[PDB]
Design an enzyme around this catalytic site. Structure first.
Site, PDB file in Angstrom:
ATOM      1  CG  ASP A  57      -1.956   1.146   1.143  1.00 56.33           C
ATOM      2  OD1 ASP A  57      -2.925   1.096   0.837  1.00 56.33           O
ATOM      3  OD2 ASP A  57      -1.615   2.014   1.610  1.00 56.33           O
ATOM      4  CG  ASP A  59      -2.115   6.119   1.176  1.00 53.14           C
ATOM      5  OD1 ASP A  59      -2.446   5.086   1.698  1.00 53.14           O
ATOM      6  OD2 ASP A  59      -3.081   7.039   1.093  1.00 53.14           O
ATOM      7  CD  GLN A  61      -4.103   7.878   5.050  1.00 55.39           C
ATOM      8  OE1 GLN A  61      -3.721   8.828   4.729  1.00 55.39           O
ATOM      9  NE2 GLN A  61      -5.511   8.070   5.452  1.00 55.39           N
ATOM     10  CD  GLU A 143     -11.543 -21.307   8.583  1.00 60.27           C
ATOM     11  OE1 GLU A 143     -11.125 -22.242   8.533  1.00 60.27           O
ATOM     12  OE2 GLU A 143     -12.470 -20.982   8.171  1.00 60.27           O
ATOM     13  CD  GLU A 177     -17.825 -13.365  18.479  1.00 66.40           C
ATOM     14  OE1 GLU A 177     -17.550 -13.937  17.558  1.00 66.40           O
ATOM     15  OE2 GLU A 177     -18.958 -13.156  18.860  1.00 66.40           O
ATOM     16  CB  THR A 194     -27.519 -14.189   5.644  1.00 67.27           C
ATOM     17  OG1 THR A 194     -27.630 -14.159   6.896  1.00 67.27           O
ATOM     18  CG2 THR A 194     -27.551 -15.462   5.054  1.00 67.27           C
ATOM     19  CB  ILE A 197     -30.972 -12.869   7.368  1.00 69.42           C
ATOM     20  CG1 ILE A 197     -31.543 -12.890   5.714  1.00 69.42           C
ATOM     21  CG2 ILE A 197     -31.947 -13.212   8.238  1.00 69.42           C
ATOM     22  CD1 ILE A 197     -31.807 -14.314   5.531  1.00 69.42           C
ATOM     23  CG  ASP A 200     -28.883 -15.117   9.687  1.00 64.01           C
ATOM     24  OD1 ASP A 200     -28.317 -13.957   9.874  1.00 64.01           O
ATOM     25  OD2 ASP A 200     -28.990 -15.760   8.490  1.00 64.01           O
ATOM     26  CG  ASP A 226     -19.788 -31.223   6.523  1.00 59.65           C
ATOM     27  OD1 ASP A 226     -18.704 -30.772   6.009  1.00 59.65           O
ATOM     28  OD2 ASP A 226     -20.215 -31.196   7.696  1.00 59.65           O
ATOM     29  CG  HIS A 231     -18.362 -27.950   8.668  1.00 58.93           C
ATOM     30  ND1 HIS A 231     -18.036 -28.990   7.937  1.00 58.93           N
ATOM     31  CD2 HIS A 231     -17.546 -26.955   8.919  1.00 58.93           C
ATOM     32  CE1 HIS A 231     -16.757 -28.239   7.364  1.00 58.93           C
ATOM     33  NE2 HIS A 231     -16.603 -27.184   8.429  1.00 58.93           N
TER      34      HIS A 231
HETATM   35 CA   LIG Z   1     -27.065 -12.547   8.661  1.00 57.32          CA
HETATM   36 CA   LIG Z   2     -19.698 -15.316  16.965  1.00 56.06          CA
HETATM   37 CA   LIG Z   3      -3.645   3.383   0.936  1.00 54.93          CA
HETATM   38 CA   LIG Z   4     -20.570 -11.603  17.719  1.00 53.67          CA
HETATM   39 ZN   LIG Z   5     -13.089 -25.494  10.433  1.00 55.36          ZN
END
Ligand SMILES: [Ca+2]
Ligand SMILES: [Ca+2]
Ligand SMILES: [Ca+2]
Ligand SMILES: [Ca+2]
Ligand SMILES: [Zn+2]
Length: 316
Positions: A57, A59, A61, A143, A177, A194, A197, A200, A226, A231
């Site tokens: 980048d 600058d 920013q 991840e 988190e 989503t 929405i 959810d 899966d 999952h």
């Molecule tokens: Ca959503």
């Molecule tokens: Ca969460």
């Molecule tokens: Ca920039």
């Molecule tokens: Ca959250």
């Molecule tokens: Zn995973």
């Protein structure tokens, strides 16, 4: 690259402004030299070649809409690094300050993100199912936690061991988190899923059945889709983890909660000490009981609560 550590500023996927560690040498690169052997973020330019180009980048920013997924992948990798270091005394995913690499703008309208064995990869989403996936702190920590797992338990990504793998990433993505204190909750991907929405998410730990996932072993998915339900059956373990932390009654089984810090301690010890590539749910219960025993004593409330949580989801 070789250069000097600097600090830039930008806006994330959700329009939030934040500082990011960068490196200067002609351009300002998304390269944070303050955490281990570095955190490096790359542009995949809508291709599937990896890693792409180290993000440069002019600058220092980062307010362009194109910059947003890069800002968040870079920033949230640092937060996850800090979580593991300050909370579990773990230096990056290998415990030896390994460099953390992420790529954004992976492919076109790609509705996913993953750890590929070497690095993190984020799609931008198609704008309906997802916005750029690095916009979720739980997604990024999920991840990155796959990397922690790769270097510790080595859980095979199939059937019960793959479901445990997934659950581990959901558990620690959520714990990150809460550590960041950024509108925390027990849902997964709510910040990026989503955009049309509200309220959810991809998965719920407090009530997996809310989105079709089993909350009891008797309701486990037994087919081949899966990877044998990695999952899906993660719901049973996510529910157990939720109960250990927050307590509750579930299928007529009562659980006294012991809080997030202790949940984290117990599962981190399980992951790093007792789980193996082919561990099944029954062995996860034994690993978690043994861990709680090591940490708090065999007649502790903590050990009792783990047993009760696993009883509640029908895992003996
Ligand atoms: Ca959503
Ligand atoms: Ca969460
Ligand atoms: Ca920039
Ligand atoms: Ca959250
Ligand atoms: Zn995973």
């Amino acid at each position: 690259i070789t250069g000097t550590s600097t600090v830039g500023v930008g806006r994330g996927v959700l329009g939030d402004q934040k500082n990011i560690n960068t490196t200067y040498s002609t351009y300002y690169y998304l390269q944070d030299n303050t955490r281990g052997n570095g955190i490096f973020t790359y542009d995949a330019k809508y291709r599937t070649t990896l890693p792409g180009s180290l993000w440069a980048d002019a600058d220092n920013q980062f307010f362009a809409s194109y910059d947003a997924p890069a800002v968040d992948a870079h920033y949230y990798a640092g937060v996850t690094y800090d979580y593991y270091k300050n909370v579990h005394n773990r230096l990056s995913y290998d415990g030896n300050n390994a460099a953390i690499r992420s790529s954004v703008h992976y492919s076109q309208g790609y509705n996913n993100a993953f750890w590929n064995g070497s690095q993190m990869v984020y799609g931008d989403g198609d704008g309906q199912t997802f916005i750029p996936l690095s916009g979720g702190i739980d997604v990024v920590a999920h991840e990155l936690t796959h990397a922690v797992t790769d270097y510790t338990a080595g859980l095979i990504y199939q059937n019960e061991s793959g479901a445990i793998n997934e659950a581990i990433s959901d558990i620690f993505g959520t714990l990150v988190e809460f550590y960041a204190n950024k509108n925390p909750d027990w849902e997964i991907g709510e910040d990026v899923y989503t955009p049309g929405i509200s309220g959810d998410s991809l998965r719920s730990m407090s009530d997996p059945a809310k989105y079709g996932d089993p909350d009891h072993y008797s309701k486990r998915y037994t087919g081949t889709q899966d990877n044998g339900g990695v999952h899906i059956n993660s719901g049973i373990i996510n529910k157990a983890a939720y109960l250990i932390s927050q307590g509750g009654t579930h299928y007529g089984v009562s659980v006294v909660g012991i809080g997030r810090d202790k949940l984290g301690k117990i599962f981190y010890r399980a992951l790093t000490q007792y789980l193996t590539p082919t561990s099944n749910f029954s062995q996860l219960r034994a690993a978690a009981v043994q861990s709680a025993t090591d940490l708090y004593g065999s007649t502790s409330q903590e050990v009792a609560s783990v047993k009760q949580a696993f009883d509640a989801v029908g895992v003996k």
